[PDB]
Design an enzyme around this catalytic site. Structure first.
Site, PDB file in Angstrom:
ATOM      1  CB  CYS A   1      42.850  35.731  29.249  1.00  0.00           C
ATOM      2  SG  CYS A   1      44.445  35.467  30.036  1.00  0.00           S
ATOM      3  CD  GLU A 126      39.374  36.074  32.912  1.00  0.00           C
ATOM      4  OE1 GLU A 126      39.037  36.771  33.924  1.00  0.00           O
ATOM      5  OE2 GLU A 126      40.575  35.786  32.601  1.00  0.00           O
TER       6      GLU A 126
END
Length: 257
Positions: A1, A126
């Site tokens: 992330c 993402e």
DNA sequence: CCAGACGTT
DNA sequence: GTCTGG
DNA sequence: CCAGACGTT
DNA sequence: GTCTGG
């Protein structure tokens, strides 16, 4: 992330961080360095995001269950780091794997000093790697939410994503403010997210988890690390490639398609 | 001992 | 600053 | 994280 | 391929 949205006006963010101390007093967290709060739909490493930490990091004899909110630099700069400029760091501290955290020089020491923070975001992005194509599909990922008129209503009631972080304090050799910088702890992606990416941030789901992580006063490293694991309590939708360039700061970044 | 790394997706 | 590799 | 640079006289 | 800047 490696990308978040955190776009809320400061007072809306602060009200969304309403909490209860150990005595059950309803409080808003007290700001430090609020001028460094920079709302954006597209927050990259090296930018500042607001994080919660224990009051006891800032005030002698404070109730450790009371919370400060403060902008910190995404990309942990260890105390010992020797160069003039943070950006010279030659290893990535954007993230900190949960599995190895106690063995990592850059993370163990500050973790050991109780420097646990909660990284706030609307949600994170993402990019999905799909077989036999270089095209990556961006997703916006967030806590399930309450089930231009609707827009204002949604964002007033938005449940902020609360990610487990570690922060460190660095005195520039040249001289300046202490740098407070953070890493977001990573874990294995849950079943919900596993077709998107093998990694996810360590999400603290609810006020018990957030509280125990913040409270280095009453909660040991060993107890804190038990809060670090995946969660299935997560939703997402695909978003345009507008997010890809971190210069693009607009609502289109997290708009569905 | 000193030298050199210190990290992740 | 602290740890690993030589 | 992705985008974009990657070099000198 | 690898690193920096955003």
């Amino acid at each position: 992330c490696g990308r978040t949205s955190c776009h809320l006006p400061r007072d809306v963010l602060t009200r969304a961080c309403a909490y209860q101390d150990r005595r059950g007093q309803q409080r808003l967290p007290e700001w430090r360095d609020p001028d460094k709060y920079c709302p954006s739909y597209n927050k990259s490493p090296q930018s500042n995001s607001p994080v919660l930490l224990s009051r006891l990091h800032f005030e002698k004899d404070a109730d450790s269950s009371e919370r400060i909110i403060a902008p910190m630099r995404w990309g942990l700069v260890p105390s010992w780091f020797k160069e003039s400029d943070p950006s010279k760091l030659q290893f990535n501290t954007t993230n900190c794997r949960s599995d190895t955290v106690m063995e990592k020089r850059s993370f163990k020491v500050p973790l050991g000093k109780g420097r646990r923070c909660v990284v706030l975001a609307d949600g994170f992005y993402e990019w999905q790697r799909c077989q036999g194509t270089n095209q990556r599909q961006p997703y916006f990922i967030y806590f399930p939410q309450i089930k231009p008129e609707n827009w204002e209503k949604v964002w007033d009631n938005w449940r902020l994503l609360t990610m487990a972080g570690i922060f460190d304090c660095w005195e520039p050799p040249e001289g300046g403010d202490v740098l407070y910088s953070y890493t977001i702890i990573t874990v294995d992606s849950c079943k919900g997210l596993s077709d998107i990416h093998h990694r996810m941030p360590a999400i603290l789901d609810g006020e018990e988890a957030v509280s125990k992580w913040l409270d280095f006063g009453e909660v040991s490293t060993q107890e804190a690390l038990k809060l670090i694991h995946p969660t299935e309590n997560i939703t997402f939708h695909a978003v345009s490639s507008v997010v890809n360039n971190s210069r693009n700061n607009t609502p289109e970044c997290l708009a569905p398609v």
